[PDB]
């Protein structure tokens, strides 16, 4: 069984360990460090993908496009804070008009 | 030329878990790859500094867990830590 299978993840536990060792973040890298990081990365990706897929269903579409990813990130204040300085290419803006400007 | 490798295979697997009948385009998949790389560099970069502060030559799951707490806001950190702790427990067992 591959290392991801033992941890129950669908992310590359082995490749993340190679990335941690290659990036010289430290002289040595623990055994559980790749498993913890892969689980965090998979959880974050699943969190966005569920939100982005919901936006596509709201937009009665069956495919995720960068606009759908932008809608999910900006609508969720937790992901919005995490990605505050992040630009999504071909993502557009959140549809919002100030009330005082409306008639 | 050499071959290029990214997280496209695993993102498809995660997407199939949450939404069985929803696909993802090429441009959206490129953004998802850039998102995973960005967070990985953030968490590893914070854990590198965090371990160096304590004169530690090793990056362990404690360093990752605290790096997650420092970077992820609010309930994002709470749920990520539980998922990370659960995965490590299953891995060692």
């Amino acid at each position: 069984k591959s290392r991801s299978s033992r941890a129950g993840l669908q992310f590359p536990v082995g490749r993340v360990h190679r990335l941690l060792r290659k990036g010289n973040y430290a002289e040595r890298v623990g055994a559980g460090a790749p498993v913890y990081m892969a689980a965090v990365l998979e959880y974050l990706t699943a969190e966005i993908l569920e939100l982005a897929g919901n936006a596509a269903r709201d937009n009665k579409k069956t495919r995720i496009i960068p606009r759908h990813l932008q809608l999910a990130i900006r609508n969720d204040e937790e992901l919005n804070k995490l990605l505050g300085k992040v630009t999504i290419a071909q993502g557009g803006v959140l549809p919002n008009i100030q009330a005082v400007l409306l008639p | 030329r050499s071959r290029k490798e990214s997280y496209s295979v695993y993102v498809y697997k995660v997407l199939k878990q949450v939404h069985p009948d929803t696909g993802i385009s090429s441009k959206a998949m490129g953004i998802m790859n850039s998102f995973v790389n960005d967070i990985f560099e953030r968490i590893a970069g914070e854990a590198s500094r965090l371990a160096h502060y304590n004169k530690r030559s090793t990056i362990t799951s404690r360093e990752i867990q605290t790096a997650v707490r420092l970077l992820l806001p609010g309930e994002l950190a709470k749920h990520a830590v539980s998922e990370g702790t659960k995965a490590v427990t299953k891995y060692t067992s």
Binding site: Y43, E50 | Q17, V18
Partner: peptide
């Protein structure tokens, strides 16, 4: 299938 919060 997958959901947390």
């Amino acid at each position: 299938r997958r959901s947390a919060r």
